[PDB]
Swiss-Prot record:
Binding site for Mn(2+) 2: D109, D111, D306
A cellular component annotation (GO) from this entry: alpha DNA polymerase:primase complex
Alphabetical list of InterPro entries matching this protein: DNA_primase_S, DNA_primase_ssu_euk/arc
Gene behind this protein: PRIM1
Binding positions for a ribonucleoside 5'-triphosphate per the UniProt entry: 109-111, 160-166, 315-318, 324
Lineage: Eukaryota, Metazoa, Chordata, Craniata, Vertebrata
Organism: Homo sapiens
Protein name: DNA primase small subunit
Written domain comment of the UniProt record: The catalytic domain (residues 1-190 and 303-408) adopts a typical 'prim' fold structure formed by two three strand beta-sheets that line the inside of the lower and upper parts, each surrounded by alpha-helices on the outside. It comprises a highly conserved catalytic triad, a structural zinc-binding motif and the nucleotide-binding motifs. The Asp-109, Asp-111 and Asp-306 catalytic triad binds two Mn2+ or Mg2+ ions which activate for nucleophilic attack the 3'-hydroxyl of the growing RNA primer or of the first NTP bound at the initiation site.
């Protein structure tokens, strides 16, 4: 924003939707094996066109119909909503209030601006190699929990194309989950709350739940390099006063003094850990520990979870393989086995892949888009494997 002339977007989009957008894989995803009738036909799609104009409640009969309409309207953005009780594109014809959102993937949307209070590196409208690690940590923290703590097997992670990282959890049972249960998942996962003028946003109890411990252990792999070297969070008085507002009055002064005697954020952090580990929860206690150190790390490194993104079944979220109009970047799947190597800055733009396409119009495999489609395919393969596995179990129950 802005790296190419935005007036070439319409012609690039036209070519993109004609030769490059992976419809086969995309339909395979949203049709979910085709075994539940109307599942794709009842999906809301929402297109954004030129000038921030968008259309709600579009839906399509099949792959060919979707292709044809995407190729006709050539949208700047594609959003995906819920699966509804009826065809979204006929919602007006429906009785009183029978048109209801019924099912959707459980989604998360981690937004880099939500870390602005604890970022020092680039700027509010930017990302850089110094803050990106926040997203890496957010992925590892949330995915571990979704996988290990909840048993969710089908989790697609997606880079927004700009400053965001999205998760779609797509398990059959998850898609059916109620709003109340979605909230409960968000509540369980949440540690950073949650106001503009609340200075201290993490308060830990004496007793550590395994979720908190396991999240902290992930942050600890990154904390030195990320917070002490890259962000340099205890660099000067101006910056370390922000950390001192998170510790008790009792120790503000002792820490202040030894901060000024050391030179590194590295050295000052070691001093903070020491001092904070000796703080007595006034008084009568005799029990000491790392709660304060953990609270600071969580405030700086733990993802902020917007309750509404995950709670509302009808919420729209930018589609994978949609283009980000501001950056030109394709919204691409992130390979979870390689999350530490994921590089948002080398994610190709629409113009770049259109160029590759006809440099001496065919297929996406001759462009830089290809590896990202391979990642999508592995995800889809796992969805195929599961359905077949469960169909076997169901088929074995129909035998007695
Ligand atoms: Zn940055």
């Amino acid at each position: 924003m802005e790296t190419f002339d935005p007036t070439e977007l319409p012609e690039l989009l036209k070519l993109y939707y004609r030769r490059l957008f992976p419809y086969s894989q995309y339909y395979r995803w949203l049709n979910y094996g085709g075994v539940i009738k109307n599942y794709f036909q009842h999906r809301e799609f929402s297109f954004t066109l030129k000038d921030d104009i968008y259309i709600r409640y579009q839906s399509f009969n099949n792959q060919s119909d979707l292709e044809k309409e995407m190729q006709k309207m050539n949208p700047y953005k594609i959003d995906i909503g819920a699966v509804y009780s009826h065809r979204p594109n006929q919602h007006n014809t429906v009785k009183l209030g029978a048109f209801q959102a019924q099912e959707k993937e459980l989604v998360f949307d981690i937004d880099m601006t939500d870390y602005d209070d604890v970022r020092r590196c680039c700027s509010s409208a930017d990302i850089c190699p110094k803050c990106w690690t926040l997203m890496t940590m957010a992925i590892r923290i949330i995915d571990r929990a979704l996988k290990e703590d909840f048993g969710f097997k089908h989790r697609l992670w997606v880079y927004s194309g700009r400053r965001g990282v999205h998760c779609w959890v797509c398990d059959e049972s998850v898609r059916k989950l109620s709003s109340a249960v979605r909230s409960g998942i968000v509540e369980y996962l949440s540690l950073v709350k949650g106001g503009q003028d609340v200075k201290k946003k993490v308060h830990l109890s004496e007793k550590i739940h395994p979720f908190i411990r396991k999240s902290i252990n992930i942050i600890k792999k990154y904390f030195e390099e990320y917070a002490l070297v890259n962000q340099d969070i205890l660099e000067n008085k101006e910056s370390w006063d922000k950390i001192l507002a998170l510790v008790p009055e009792t120790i503000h002064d002792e820490l202040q003094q030894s901060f000024q005697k050391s030179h590194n954020s590295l050295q000052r952090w070691e001093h903070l850990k020491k001092v904070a580990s000796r703080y007595q929860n006034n008084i009568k206690n005799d029990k000491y520990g790392p709660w304060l150190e953990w609270e600071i790390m969580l405030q700086y490194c733990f993802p902020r979870l917007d309750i509404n993104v995950s709670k509302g079944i009808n919420h729209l979220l930018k589609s994978p393989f949609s283009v980000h109009p501001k950056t030109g970047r394709i919204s691409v799947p992130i390979d979870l086995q390689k999350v530490d190597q994921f590089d948002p800055f080398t994610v190709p733009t629409i113009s770049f892949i259109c160029r590759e396409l006809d440099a001496i119009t065919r297929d996406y495999k001759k462009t830089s888009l290809a590896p990202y489609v391979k990642v999508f395919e592995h995800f889809l393969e796992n969805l195929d494997k599961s359905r077949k596995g469960e169909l076997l179990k169901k088929s074995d129950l129909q035998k007695d």
